[PDB]
């Protein structure tokens, strides 16, 4: 029975080979398939693609040299049936998802010992991308423009996001061997660049899902992943730097702190059109009109704030000392009572939670600046500063560490957050009313660990590092091999 299906695909491989695929005979061939009972039912169709793939991998076997003439023909068949077939309203979505499910299904069946190789599957996925990348050229103009075209335009954004979903199924965590082969597909010239350039960031949702899978793995066959991870973010930093700026919140959360180099590149990212002044040169950012702009954020941190949305906002309005106690009590609760971690990072201070707070305050502080003349937003007695100031003083050591860490991370390109949080860091460092050596040491520690690593050094830290000496209030800090840096710069 299965041998029959093999003979059919044997007819397809022989036809397309030695013939230009563009010729309409191939479209008639698939029209000949439905004539018989082979493709008559979907149960047989998915069975046809099933066996057709297992044959290509077998055909790849026993091959001394690059036999893809069998699998590349299949890759075109997948696309040729996606376009040449008449689909119902929701059926087109189920179709592409079905085939992808089969491909990854065989992959798992192959990964289970029964001489597995990761090159042919990679070739198949690559062909599907290259093929579809050719079809979607200029709003799908190549097709008849019968306004079946219109159906494909709406399918364009749904194709990659679903494809990214099936790519996630073969994440490095799943298959160690396919790890390197997985990164190369992520950074495919037909996948990464256009999804970043998709209309209004629709694809950014699933692009994150893949990078997080990459970060969680980093938290050996890891070297190949990290080495591949770096050239992606850098590639994005040049192509679409906004992607690193807006989604920084959801990105910094799942990124281990051990990686300081990778940290900077994300925060060092700047918009394409913009150009910045020399940071190492000496004040008055009010003169700069660029920092007044509000930095966009794709993911609002208020969601992961959950129940503290009320007491924080009520505190941001009026600084109630009674409302301060409950907020702290909530943090201490999530740290010790519940949300117990394991091993290292046991009784963790929820970095996501702390980062969400510090970021949320900055956002609300930004809106408060766009409105109402902006004179009030910067003060020692301002509510936006009062909250961050009190959480530190009443917070524990590890608790204070995360707050300062989060603040420093927001110092990026010339925006109001960088402007504000800098004024926070600057003021706090020179701020009295503390009982102080402990705090300043954390101010320095979390800040110092952003310059020592190789460039590019972020703009925000560079300026704050400059005005610090320019402010004149040096090594006088008694805690300072720490003095080795002073001689460095």
């Amino acid at each position: 029975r299965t041998e029959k299906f093999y003979l059919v695909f044997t007819e397809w491989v022989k036809l397309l080979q030695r013939v230009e695929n563009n010729d309409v005979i191939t479209t008639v061939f698939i029209k000949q398939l439905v004539e018989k009972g082979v493709i008559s039912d979907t149960d047989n169709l998915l069975t046809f693609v099933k066996s057709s793939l297992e044959l290509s991998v077998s055909s790849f076997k026993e091959s001394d040299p690059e036999v893809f003439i069998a699998i590349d023909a299949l890759g075109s068949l997948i696309i040729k049936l996606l376009i040449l077939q008449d689909f119902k309203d929701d059926t087109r979505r189920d179709y592409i998802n079905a085939i992808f499910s089969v491909i990854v299904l065989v992959f798992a069946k192959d990964h289970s010992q029964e001489t597995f190789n990761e090159r042919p599957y990679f070739r198949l996925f690559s062909n599907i991308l290259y093929e579809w990348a050719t079809i979607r050229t200029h709003n799908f103009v190549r097709i008849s423009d019968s306004s079946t075209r219109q159906e494909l335009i709406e399918f364009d954004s749904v194709f990659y996001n679903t494809f990214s979903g099936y790519l996630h199924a073969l994440q490095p965590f799943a298959f160690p061997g396919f790890s390197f082969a997985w990164v190369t597909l992520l950074s495919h010239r037909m996948l990464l660049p256009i999804m970043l350039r998709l209309p209004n960031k629709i694809g950014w949702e699933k692009l994150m899902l893949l990078i997080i899978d990459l970060f969680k793995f980093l938290d050996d066959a890891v070297s190949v992943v990290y080495k591949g991870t770096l050239r992606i973010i850098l590639g994005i930093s040049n192509d679409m730097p906004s992607f690193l700026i807006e989604n920084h919140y959801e990105l910094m959360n799942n990124l281990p702190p051990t990686y300081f180099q990778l940290k900077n590149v994300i925060l060092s990212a700047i918009p394409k059109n913009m150009t910045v002044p020399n940071p190492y040169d000496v004040l008055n950012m009010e003169d700069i009109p660029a920092c007044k702009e509000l930095p966009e954020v794709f993911f609002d941190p208020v969601i992961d704030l959950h129940s503290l949305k009320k007491p924080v906002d009520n505190y941001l309005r009026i600084p109630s000392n009674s409302l301060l106690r409950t907020i702290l009590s909530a943090i201490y609760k999530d740290t010790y009572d519940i949300k117990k971690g394991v091993g290292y990072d046991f009784l963790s201070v929820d970095s996501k939670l702390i980062r969400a707070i510090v970021l949320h305050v900055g956002i609300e502080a930004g809106i408060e600046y766009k409105r109402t003349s902006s004179n009030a937003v910067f003060n020692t007695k301002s509510s936006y500063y009062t909250l961050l100031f009190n959480l530190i003083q009443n917070g524990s050591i590890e608790m204070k560490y995360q707050i300062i860490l989060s603040i420093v991370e927001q110092l990026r390109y010339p925006n109001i957050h960088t402007y504000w949080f800098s004024f926070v860091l600057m003021n706090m460092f020179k701020s009295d009313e503390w009982n102080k050596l402990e705090v300043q040491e954390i101010i320095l520690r979390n800040f110092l660990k952003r310059i020592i690593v190789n460039k590019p050094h972020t703009w925000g830290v560079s300026v704050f590092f400059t005005q610090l000496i320019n402010n004149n209030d040096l090594l006088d800090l008694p805690f300072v091999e720490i003095k080795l840096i002073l001689q460095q710069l």
Partner: protein, 50 residues
């Protein structure tokens, strides 16, 4: 020596599991491709139904 059960056996069933999911007839675009030209072409197959 696993009786029937195996990782490869479980998955091969999954591919068949997904096949019978949402059975539909494959509707080719009848409007397109100049029908009655299709009738002129050869068999182009070695199929045997049953």
């Amino acid at each position: 020596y696993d009786a029937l059960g195996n990782a490869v056996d479980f998955l091969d069933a999954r591919l068949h599991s997904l096949s019978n999911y949402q059975k539909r007839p494959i509707s080719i675009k009848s409007n397109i491709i100049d029908e009655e030209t299709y009738k002129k072409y050869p068999s182009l197959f070695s199929w045997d139904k049953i």
